[PDB]
């Protein structure tokens, strides 16, 4: 047998593979399984077993579907595909990894350009990749290493040397962590100017004559005139340095000193509360500055330690809603936040409402169908009530709009529809195992019309009476909601409803339950029936 079959009949490959297959999201299992596979190929070469190489590519690519933000493994899968020889697949792995991060990542752009340098060999296109990298990641606080790459490529390839000045003048205004280095390059590269015509490298001719009073066409003794010119340009650089030093020292001292973790780890890692607080404040600072490249970069840069939380998926969505006025942008942010975050309830709530504002109701129907399908057409039985209740509100909006009303005065039947009322009754029938009983009753009360009040009274109030469910009968909120259903009927007159509540409803409750029911029922009575407050107190003592 070959090295592949010796690998596939190993005892360890069964357990490592099988632990990954049991626990897909835990990632120490994926890393042990992958390290073992790669190590059992003693030397990776162009002649190692093609079944074994196909097994390696399947392992890394499935891990990069499960955990799309691991930057270092996109780089490692690209370098492995380089060593095997085909630089085209390694191009596609770097571009796939850049795509996972919406183009906005410094490590992947830095490594993709250090790679690209060797293998492009077409100069206009190699430089167009640096001009693409610079618009997405160029304003990063740690982006000095990118600009070193761009400047060394310019200084080797270009013959003219105007492009170096034109790039370095832009770099002079970015508040980078290593901003001084490029000020020192500009100062040395000014200091080596050896005549007047070189000063047209720096800026334009007219700006020198008008703003700084330097004439390049000055014919005369040109020595001291040049020393005066260099003194003036060193002063204008001093003021620009002073601005950028204020920016950089402010950003470092408040915010960037405080963040310690800059990279995605695994869906099971926690972040300290300090870093959550300074990421929230640092995003607020960035949004104030109003540089949109830099706000998008800083949200993407902030999703790395805390992709799986959801406070920044919500926050980035809100910034797109109200500060940029963009709802399709915010839908795409929240929709992508479903993939990452573990909580998902606040995102689904806000995404339902973003879709409803975007007038795309069929997508809302599909998300409601996927949430009822995810619980096996049985959302009524979910332990966590917030899923069921948000589902049910937006499903009711779709349902009132979809089926015309059955009751008078165009009173849209919300929970009184045979599809929805069966879910509500099926959750009411579990009585203590489920969580959200009083909220569900308390929203069923709100109909206020004679036809609607009669249906709600007969189906949930009379029926839980006659079944004798002790949970609902001992509970004060049940009786309070029933009295409040009848009392706010616009149909019944005052004597009718007071007659009904005191004479029909209040005898029905048992006297053993008085110690449980009388706190709430008194609170109804004093609020609306001060006159009958003796009767109640007499009925239960």
């Amino acid at each position: 047998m070959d090295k592949y079959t010796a690998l596939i009949h190993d005892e360890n490959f069964s357990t490592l593979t099988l632990n990954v297959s049991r626990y897909p999201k835990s990632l120490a299992y994926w890393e042990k399984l992958l390290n073992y596979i790669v190590k059992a190929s003693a030397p990776i070469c162009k002649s190692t077993e093609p079944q074994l190489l196909k097994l390696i590519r399947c392992t890394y690519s499935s891990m990069l579907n499960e955990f799309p933000y691991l930057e270092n493994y996109y780089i490692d899968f690209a370098l492995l595909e380089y060593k095997l020889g085909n630089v085209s697949m390694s191009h596609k792995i770097f571009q796939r990894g850049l795509q996972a991060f919406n183009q906005r990542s410094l490590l992947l752009w830095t490594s993709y350009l250090k790679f690209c340098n060797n293998v492009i060999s077409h100069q206009k296109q190699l430089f167009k990749k640096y001009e693409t990298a610079e618009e997405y990641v160029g304003l990063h606080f740690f982006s000095g290493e990118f600009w070193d790459l761009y400047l060394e490529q310019i200084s080797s390839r270009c013959t003219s040397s105007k492009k170096y000045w034109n790039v370095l003048r832009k770099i002079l205004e970015i508040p980078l962590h290593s901003f001084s280095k490029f000020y020192a390059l500009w100062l040395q590269r000014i200091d080596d100017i050896m005549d007047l015509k070189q000063l047209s490298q720096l800026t334009s001719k007219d700006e020198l004559l008008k703003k700084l009073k330097i004439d390049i066409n000055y014919s005369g003794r040109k020595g001291p005139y040049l020393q005066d010119a260099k003194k003036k340009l060193k002063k204008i650089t001093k003021e620009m340095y002073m601005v950028v030093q204020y920016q950089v020292l402010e950003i470092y001292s408040i915010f960037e000193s405080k963040i310690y973790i800059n990279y995605y780890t695994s869906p099971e890692t926690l972040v300290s509360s300090d870093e959550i607080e300074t990421w929230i404040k640092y995003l607020d600072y960035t949004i104030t500055l109003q540089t949109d490249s830099l706000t998008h970069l800083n949200f993407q840069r902030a999703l790395l330690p805390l992709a799986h939380y959801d406070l920044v998926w919500i926050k980035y969505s809100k910034w797109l809603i109200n500060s940029k006025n963009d709802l399709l942008g915010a839908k795409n942010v929240l929709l992508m936040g479903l993939k990452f975050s573990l909580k998902k309830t606040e995102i689904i709530k806000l995404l339902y409402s973003v879709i409803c504002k975007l007038n795309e109701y069929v997508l809302l129907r599909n998300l409601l169908e996927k949430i009822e399908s995810s619980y096996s057409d049985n959302v009524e039985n979910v332990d966590d009530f917030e899923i069921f209740w948000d589902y049910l509100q937006f499903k009711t909006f779709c349902q009132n709009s979809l089926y015309s009303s059955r009751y008078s005065d165009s009173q849209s039947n919300g929970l009184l529809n045979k599809e929805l009322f069966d879910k509500v009754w099926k959750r009411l029938s579990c009585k203590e195992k489920k969580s959200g009983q009083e909220i569900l009753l308390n929203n069923l009360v709100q109909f206020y019309s004679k036809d609607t009040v009669e249906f709600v009274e007969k189906n949930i109030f009379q029926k839980i009476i006659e079944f004798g469910w002790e949970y609902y009968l001992q509970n004060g909120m049940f009786w309070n909601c029933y009295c409040r259903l009848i009392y706010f009927d616009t149909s019944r007159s005052y004597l009718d409803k007071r007659q009904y509540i005191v004479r029909k409803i209040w005898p029905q409750i048992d006297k053993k339950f008085a110690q449980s029911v009388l706190p709430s029922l008194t609170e109804f009575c004093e609020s609306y029936f001060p006159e009958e407050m003796d009767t109640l107190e007499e009925m239960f003592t």
Partner: protein, 50 residues
């Protein structure tokens, strides 16, 4: 140039930094398999009569 296969220290090997890689240009000659002088060298005996 992260590494050095040379005998020199790193500072000396940075001095031997090469030019950028050569650009690619499409060939104007014959591919190596198609190279041949003349085949169909015609015969010498036809001259001898006339």
């Amino acid at each position: 140039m992260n590494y050095n296969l040379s005998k020199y220290p790193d500072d000396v090997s940075r001095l031997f930094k090469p030019r950028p890689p050569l650009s690619y240009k499409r060939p104007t000659d014959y591919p190596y398999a198609k190279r041949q002088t003349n085949p169909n060298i015609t015969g010498v005996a036809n001259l001898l009569s006339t």
